[PDB]
Amino acid sequence: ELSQCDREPIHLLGGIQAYGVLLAFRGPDRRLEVVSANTQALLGRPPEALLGKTAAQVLPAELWAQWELLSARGALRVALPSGPYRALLHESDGLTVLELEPAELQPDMEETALELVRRLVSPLAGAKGTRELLQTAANTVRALTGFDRVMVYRFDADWHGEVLAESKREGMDGFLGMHFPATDIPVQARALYTRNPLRLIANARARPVPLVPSVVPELGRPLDLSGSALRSVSPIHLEYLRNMGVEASFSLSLLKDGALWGLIACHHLAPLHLSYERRRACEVLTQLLALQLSSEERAAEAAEDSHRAALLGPLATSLGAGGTLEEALAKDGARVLELTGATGAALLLGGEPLLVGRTPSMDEVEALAAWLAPQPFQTSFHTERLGSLYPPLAARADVAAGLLAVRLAPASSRLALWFRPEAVRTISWAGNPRKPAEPEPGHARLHPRGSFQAWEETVRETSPAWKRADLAAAEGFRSALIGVVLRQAAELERLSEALSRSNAELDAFGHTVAHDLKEPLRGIQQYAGFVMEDYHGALGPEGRGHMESLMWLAQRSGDMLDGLFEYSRAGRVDLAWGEVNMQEVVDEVLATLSTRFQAEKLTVRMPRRLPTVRCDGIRIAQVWANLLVNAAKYQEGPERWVEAGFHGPGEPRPGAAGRYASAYVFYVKDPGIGIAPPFHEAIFEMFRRLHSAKAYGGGTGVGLAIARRLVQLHGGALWVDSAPKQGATFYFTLGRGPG
Amino acid sequence: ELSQCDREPIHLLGGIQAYGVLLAFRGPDRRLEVVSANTQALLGRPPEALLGKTAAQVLPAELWAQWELLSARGALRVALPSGPYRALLHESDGLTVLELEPAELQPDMEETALELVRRLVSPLAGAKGTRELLQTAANTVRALTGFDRVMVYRFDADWHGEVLAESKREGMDGFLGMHFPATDIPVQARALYTRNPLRLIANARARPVPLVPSVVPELGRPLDLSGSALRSVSPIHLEYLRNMGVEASFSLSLLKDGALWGLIACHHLAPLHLSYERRRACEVLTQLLALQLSSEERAAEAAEDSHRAALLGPLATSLGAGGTLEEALAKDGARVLELTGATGAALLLGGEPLLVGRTPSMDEVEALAAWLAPQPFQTSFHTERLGSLYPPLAARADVAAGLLAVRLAPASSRLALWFRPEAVRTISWAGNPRKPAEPEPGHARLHPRGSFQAWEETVRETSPAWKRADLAAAEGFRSALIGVVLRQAAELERLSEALSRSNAELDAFGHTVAHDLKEPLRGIQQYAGFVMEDYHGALGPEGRGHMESLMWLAQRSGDMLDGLFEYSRAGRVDLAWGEVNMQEVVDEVLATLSTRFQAEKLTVRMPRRLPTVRCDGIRIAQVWANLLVNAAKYQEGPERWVEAGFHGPGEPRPGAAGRYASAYVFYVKDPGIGIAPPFHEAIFEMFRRLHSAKAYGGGTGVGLAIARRLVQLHGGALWVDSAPKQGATFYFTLGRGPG
Ligand SMILES: */C=C/C1=C(C)C(=O)N/C1=C\C1=NC(=C\c2[nH]c(/C=C3/NC(=O)C(C=C)=C3C)c(C)c2CCC(=O)O)/C(CCC(=O)O)=C1C
Ligand SMILES: */C=C\C1=C(C)C(=O)N/C1=C\C1=NC(=C\c2[nH]c(/C=C3\NC(=O)C(C=C)=C3C)c(C)c2CCC(=O)O)/C(CCC(=O)O)=C1C
């Protein structure tokens, strides 16, 4: 920036303060080439003639008594006929630089300075907070320097700083709680202050002392004074101080690590000068303060992050505990809002967005959801001034001041949204930030602000800035728990509803079968009616036989259709508790399956007749037929047979049949392949088989389910004792029935 | 060797090191009550003869001049004819103790006070964590004082000592990693170290100087010396140092909120002296170190807890994705252990125990799991020592010294538990560097192999205490991982049986349509054979017609079955292409639905003649019938008329019909209520009706799905344009079919 401020060079102005004396040396010869003009008082010779001559006779002889140890160390206190002076040496631009300053006069303060500086570390420090540290540091600085006003200036990320602590004298004007514009500190000053910890300005009204010669012959520019301590500041800042009304200034820099955290500023109303040892004490004070501040801020950040993680966890615990995703989220919307300190939570799981708290209206929320897809961000996005970037939503910015968005899915429209409310803030400036300076004709300079009276700027459509902890919480919300639980909850809900539609379709199919089953009955009645009753004689023998075959085929088809309707259909399957001979039903089932038994080489074994029990004959016959079909379907042994019997009251029974102490336990045993004992309860399920569907001469697996349902409806249960290559025995328990 | 060690007092030894001088005063007149034996050299008078003598006479007038200043400040440097002599003053027990020590010969202008503070503090600009803080502090202290060895000791929970950081001169043995029992530093020593922050032993070989009189006349005990800094040392510690071969000692205490935390010890092989400025700087150094340590420990604990919480992140992310809990444990066996910092994880989820890392044998694990059940604990159990409580595992405590268990099932014996070995194999050996020295003392006091052996016996079969962070992490695991895995297993079983139910429903539909095609394969055959049964006019025409009617009914029944084959599934039939006129299909549909149109007062409108398209006649007729039924179902207007038209290639058509760029688009328009544009696609779903199922004379919601499926199978798509109270128009696009 080549504008009045940044364009002005520093550390090359060549201005020297009044009281100092400056000398330069180079090479082993150590001659004089850069000397100030105010040395005539000390040296007693024309400084212009003193340039280049033998230094061995220029400076007073008393200095050479400790010259070597001063060069070894860098600081020296020496008595002169004019008075006791302080001397420092430093190598700048490849040349030795010597300074002479009016030294201190009271030799009784240096020891007390240790006691004074001990007050910052203190028996008590930080027990009440960082504010205590700052105010104690300011008070100690003020007591040490003897100045009037001492303030602490903390820089911001935008390089416009504030003041935190303050120490005052009676009658002065305080500057607590004001914001100064970032233009007050140019880049050159920030660059310089990373290397020179402190500086002093004794007299604002004093004209800077020129340096002779004007420029260095081998450089063409005045010698750098960055490492020195007597450089005069640019007159623009002098005018700034004069307009402020102060007289003398003295500042130190707080370095966190290569970064200017802040300054310690001191002002005065009269000319005043400080000793070297006092400045060293203040430097040590700043060192200690910087150490403590860095440690405390690190601890605070770590504690905040740990607290946010330990708040993230319980959300996962609570979500896992519950079983109603939307309702569980609603009943603890405060927790998710506090997760990042927001007021509106919005969830996008591919369906209707979920809204909690102060949230934008629906139209706005899918307007935003449509957006943020064109905007490229790798994982997440966040902003405070949404209305500026998004004019459409700037209208109702009260509930949509600022936002944060996280890509819930890896790459989709599933986004999590946090909305902040409008926060009203006002800030004070010592002067008008809009006009940091007044231009002058020629644009060679920009005069500083004429006044620094309080001016109020009120911001609108703003919310507190996002903290790093908020970003960490959002990132830990995207994945690393909480994300897994809500992803799986959404999958669970959106597929459980699909399964609900699935059994709804199953019920619809059942109702369709129920209302269509009236057609086979009507067709069978029509086929039976008007035939074989009036035209039976006219049909002849062959006609009557063909009609009988047709009627038998129709009846068989109707019976098969009725049996296939094993579901609920129009009427749920039930049992009629009646005195029906179980032996007769078993014999009828065997006669019906006699052809299958002969084809499968299965012999019906009846060691004893099944006792009669109070149960439906049709249901008992169906259960027996299903059990026989299941036993003979997976029968591979050459000796295939089915043994049917029953254990009554007190009759011996195997362990599996003895599980239920029913009055009657009908057992059918076959020496087939059988099923695994774990699969014995599995085969009883609907359409469950231990072999391939197309194997064992085809199968459906619904017979075992029908038998189990019949047993359950009869007050008992069906248990199959089956072992690998050891045969199978299915026992069904018959209860007393309804009473 | 003396057992009277932890009880013997250090205050009342009545001894002062060789170089110092001590006087005691009492009363307003400041009489003499306690003096040392070195007063003869510095005063030139008999020691005991000065007791009870007036203060002004005995003490030289030089320190009398500064006596009030000495009382005010507390310390003062004063030159005496013999030489410089620093004076200290403090009130011990109602007796004012004055302290004279030989000040160093330096003229105090080499490295004055408050200057060493900067030298010590400057290298502490970094010090990211806590260990490097102590390391750098020890290094810079050894650089400043120049002592041979510097060590840092940290105290354990029960005052066990551990060497943390060592900064040593090259040449001697290193003691980094030591461990000594609490008995090596008695209670009185700890109290003294807490009280004052400095301790210095100038010479180990110096004989202590006695105190005359041997006891105070009044209190009956030797004068207190805790407040002072020249009290003698116990002979046992002198023997300790002599065996160690250490001459002078310098120790700085470390505090934390008033509780002792560690020590900084300095050892030298020869007597040495320290300037008082260095000591006065070291005091401030200790204060600053305590202030730093508090925040550093807080931040370290917070960061450790945060990392423990975040470790659940990747572990949870391992779940959810395809894998088993045991599988994740097997590959992530590494990450699990540092969740509690153990060497072995065991868990009993319901099957055989799972063991990862270092753990006892499986049978012992099962026995321990059985033994845990009687012990009453709600959720968490944990011991640092197991042999004291579990005798069976006491012998093999080397790998199972301590344990931490948490139950998984609320009531059942499902628990997960981490094992930690004894705190003697974890610690790296440091105590016995071999090369034993030539002297061989009793070595019960000699640290080499003397200590670190009692400590081994004191802590054998014991694990480091379960830190609160580890317990919190274990609780978080038990909560979150179980609350995730339970619903993960629920999801697994749920979609398993959902897929099973869907495929079983499809297979049952296929089997049922097979059965309901085989049944009419006999029914229609019987109906046809009934005609040939008569084979003559004997049956008569009318009766024969009845048979014909039955045949038609049979055919109708078959048609119904065919309808079922096209009802539940999308098409359940192979696609075909044929030259079937769309106008003929529309006319046939209108004629079939003529009764329905007359009953519902529906008028068939034909704005244009439907051309001929390459599509199946049956499929086109079914699609048209479904569209007409859907249009007439939701028709509530008085002038309810259905208009059927066709748009060819390049002809004007509605935008919805223009979605599919097909040659022909057949559109059916009705003035009924229609469906919402969002519900236009939802209505196309099978069994999806926007109104009540029983409303509008019943409904199924499968005709639109069938039409959409036919359109999709015909190389096109089916669209519906409808708005609330704006009619509806269903357009089906017909493609060119296969090439
Ligand atoms: C009968 C009691 C004691 C036995 C036990 C013993 O060995 N020392 C006993 C009393 C005191 N020890 C004091 C100082 C001290 N001792 C240790 C022990 C150590 N453990 C180690 O590993 C090492 C080094 C290898 C040592 C030296 C320490 C660490 C200390 C403090 C360090 C120091 O001040 O030098 C003591 C106080 C003496 C005093 O007045 O200063 C007593 C009493
Ligand atoms: C481009 C012109 C210009 C405008 C006017 C302006 O505000 N500053 C400026 C140029 C320079 N000012 C320099 C020095 C300087 N300014 C400040 C500002 C403050 N004084 C306070 O009391 C205070 C509060 C707290 C603030 C923010 C300060 C602190 C300085 C440093 C000098 C002091 O120690 O006071 C400057 C660099 C010259 C130099 O410092 O050597 C330029 C170029």
Describe the structure.
The PDB classes it as signaling protein. The first copy, chain A, is rod-shaped, with a radius of gyration of 50 Å. By secondary structure, the first copy, chain A, is of the alpha+beta class. The longest helix of chain A has 46 residues, at 276-321. In chain A, the strands form eight sheets. Chain A has a five-stranded antiparallel sheet with strand order 7-6-11-10-8, with helices on one face. Chain A has a five-stranded antiparallel sheet with strand order 13-12-16-15-14, covered by helices on one side. Chain A has 22 helices and 27 strands. Among the domains of chain A are: 323-422 and 466-486, 2-Layer Sandwich (Beta-Lactamase); 497-551; 579-734, 2-Layer Sandwich (Heat Shock Protein 90), CATH 3.30.565.10. The N and C termini of chain A lie far apart (103 Å). At the A-B interface, α5, α9, α15, α16 and α17 of A face α5, α9, α14 and α15 of B. One biliverdine IX alpha is lined by residues 4-5, 8, 10, 151, 153, 180, 183-186, 188-189, 199, 233-234, 236-237, 240, 249, 251, 263, 265, 437, 446, 448 of chain A.
